[PDB]
Design an enzyme around this catalytic site. Structure first.
Site, PDB file in Angstrom:
ATOM      1  N   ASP A 153       0.816  -1.212   0.000  1.00 32.28           N
ATOM      2  CA  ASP A 153       0.000   0.000   0.000  1.00 32.28           C
ATOM      3  C   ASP A 153       0.854   1.267   0.000  1.00 32.28           C
ATOM      4  O   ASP A 153       1.223   1.759   1.061  1.00 32.28           O
ATOM      5  CB  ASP A 153      -0.916  -0.054   1.227  1.00 32.28           C
ATOM      6  CG  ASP A 153      -1.983   1.009   1.233  1.00 32.28           C
ATOM      7  OD1 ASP A 153      -1.876   1.992   0.464  1.00 32.28           O
ATOM      8  OD2 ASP A 153      -2.935   0.858   2.031  1.00 32.28           O
ATOM      9  N   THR A 154       1.135   1.810  -1.187  1.00 34.33           N
ATOM     10  CA  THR A 154       1.994   2.989  -1.288  1.00 34.33           C
ATOM     11  C   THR A 154       1.366   4.243  -0.676  1.00 34.33           C
ATOM     12  O   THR A 154       2.078   5.209  -0.374  1.00 34.33           O
ATOM     13  CB  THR A 154       2.421   3.280  -2.758  1.00 34.33           C
ATOM     14  OG1 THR A 154       1.268   3.436  -3.597  1.00 34.33           O
ATOM     15  CG2 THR A 154       3.274   2.136  -3.296  1.00 34.33           C
ATOM     16  N   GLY A 155       0.043   4.229  -0.487  1.00 32.35           N
ATOM     17  CA  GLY A 155      -0.657   5.357   0.110  1.00 32.35           C
ATOM     18  C   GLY A 155      -0.675   5.333   1.627  1.00 32.35           C
ATOM     19  O   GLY A 155      -1.176   6.261   2.250  1.00 32.35           O
TER      20      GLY A 155
HETATM   21  C1  LIG Z   1      -6.857   1.134   3.661  1.00 26.38           C
HETATM   22  C2  LIG Z   1      -6.783   0.798   2.173  1.00 26.38           C
HETATM   23  C3  LIG Z   1      -7.261  -0.635   1.941  1.00 26.38           C
HETATM   24  C4  LIG Z   1      -7.614   1.761   1.325  1.00 26.38           C
HETATM   25  N1  LIG Z   1      -7.263   3.176   1.491  1.00 26.38           N
HETATM   26  C5  LIG Z   1      -6.052   3.568   0.739  1.00 26.38           C
HETATM   27  C6  LIG Z   1      -4.861   3.789   1.669  1.00 26.38           C
HETATM   28  O1  LIG Z   1      -3.631   3.938   0.931  1.00 26.38           O
HETATM   29  C7  LIG Z   1      -5.046   5.032   2.536  1.00 26.38           C
HETATM   30  C8  LIG Z   1      -4.971   6.326   1.734  1.00 26.38           C
HETATM   31  C9  LIG Z   1      -5.081   7.512   2.658  1.00 26.38           C
HETATM   32  C10 LIG Z   1      -3.936   8.194   3.049  1.00 26.38           C
HETATM   33  C11 LIG Z   1      -4.015   9.284   3.906  1.00 26.38           C
HETATM   34  C12 LIG Z   1      -5.257   9.716   4.368  1.00 26.38           C
HETATM   35  C13 LIG Z   1      -6.410   9.046   3.964  1.00 26.38           C
HETATM   36  C14 LIG Z   1      -6.330   7.949   3.105  1.00 26.38           C
HETATM   37  N2  LIG Z   1      -3.989   5.107   3.518  1.00 26.38           N
HETATM   38  C15 LIG Z   1      -4.164   4.950   4.824  1.00 26.38           C
HETATM   39  O2  LIG Z   1      -5.206   4.640   5.379  1.00 26.38           O
HETATM   40  O3  LIG Z   1      -2.965   5.198   5.601  1.00 26.38           O
HETATM   41  C16 LIG Z   1      -3.098   4.917   6.992  1.00 26.38           C
HETATM   42  C17 LIG Z   1      -3.050   3.419   7.197  1.00 26.38           C
HETATM   43  C18 LIG Z   1      -1.601   3.121   7.564  1.00 26.38           C
HETATM   44  O4  LIG Z   1      -0.899   4.355   7.442  1.00 26.38           O
HETATM   45  C19 LIG Z   1      -1.818   5.435   7.625  1.00 26.38           C
HETATM   46  S1  LIG Z   1      -8.546   4.187   1.389  1.00 26.38           S
HETATM   47  O5  LIG Z   1      -8.101   5.549   1.367  1.00 26.38           O
HETATM   48  O6  LIG Z   1      -9.340   3.884   2.531  1.00 26.38           O
HETATM   49  C20 LIG Z   1      -9.402   3.960   0.028  1.00 26.38           C
HETATM   50  C21 LIG Z   1     -10.358   2.954  -0.088  1.00 26.38           C
HETATM   51  C22 LIG Z   1     -11.059   2.755  -1.282  1.00 26.38           C
HETATM   52  C23 LIG Z   1     -10.790   3.570  -2.386  1.00 26.38           C
HETATM   53  N3  LIG Z   1     -11.482   3.410  -3.547  1.00 26.38           N
HETATM   54  C24 LIG Z   1      -9.860   4.595  -2.270  1.00 26.38           C
HETATM   55  C25 LIG Z   1      -9.170   4.783  -1.076  1.00 26.38           C
END
Ligand SMILES: CC(C)CN(C[C@@H](O)[C@H](Cc1ccccc1)NC(=O)O[C@H]1CCOC1)S(=O)(=O)c1ccc(N)cc1
Ligand SMILES: CC(C)CN(C[C@@H](O)[C@H](Cc1ccccc1)NC(=O)O[C@H]1CCOC1)S(=O)(=O)c1ccc(N)cc1
Lengths: 99, 99
Positions: free
Chosen positions: B25-27
């Site tokens: 998960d790069t995000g």
């Molecule tokens: C949790 C995963 C499975 C899914 N997410 C993507 C992740 O990369 C998510 C992206 C993000 C970064 C910063 C703030 C808010 C969101 N990062 C994340 O939560 O970082 C946390 C967990 C650890 O470090 C911090 S999502 O945003 O919920 C999501 C879900 C469905 C769609 N269609 C689009 C986005």
């Protein structure tokens, strides 16, 4: 480009004529952008992640320019705290994870 | 490997003597795993995602094996809907995004 992960993988995109910064996010099934106006038809959808769910507007077949790569596909819009480019558009730029 | 993004980039990890499926998960800044009874010292923290914040246990200097790559770092444990490998460990396995 090759993007290392020491910092967040942020890039400039253009959507609806406007430039924005967005995260290249392999953990996101579909692209979701912070609240904005977009022309065209949409339908409501839920997405879930860490912290729970949000309600978004799903717009189909929307042109987006991502670091000079032109893609066209689904863009969700809703109360995400960050602009996120998900797998649906990462595949369209030919993005892979490598190690 | 070179991993395409048509499907979720799920891999097998080894942590705390268990084999688990996790999302590259790069995000995600941090690595967060579904609730599990991991021994060791931890500190309570909160992390935010798309839907809001969750309380997690923060474990430091935990060995994790990801696709044969043996690394050590901070693992968060809490009510995430999916096991997520974030940038803190993606950098350690030498993962980059390429397009
Ligand atoms: C949790 C995963 C499975 C899914 N997410 C993507 C992740 O990369 C998510 C992206 C993000 C970064 C910063 C703030 C808010 C969101 N990062 C994340 O939560 O970082 C946390 C967990 C650890 O470090 C911090 S999502 O945003 O919920 C999501 C879900 C469905 C769609 N269609 C689009 C986005
Ligand atoms: C914090 C929430 C999960 C509620 N807790 C339940 C606890 O089992 C909680 C479960 C948990 C395990 C692993 C990671 C995160 C949470 N253990 C725990 O170690 O969590 C710490 C770590 C980070 O923050 C609190 S609760 O407050 O104790 C409680 C107890 C009874 C009632 N009726 C209401 C609340």
């Amino acid at each position: 480009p090759q993007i290392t992960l020491w910092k967040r993988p942020l890039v400039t995109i253009r959507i609806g004529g406007q430039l924005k910064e967005a995260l290249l996010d392999t953990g996101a099934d579909d692209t979701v952008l912070e609240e904005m106006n977009l022309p065209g038809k949409w339908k409501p959808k839920m997405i879930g992640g860490v912290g729970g769910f949000i309600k978004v507007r799903q717009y189909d077949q929307i042109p987006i320019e991502i670091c000079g790569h032109k893609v066209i596909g689904t863009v969700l819009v809703g109360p995400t705290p960050v602009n996120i480019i998900g797998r649906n558009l990462l595949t369209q730029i030919g993005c892979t994870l490598n190690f």
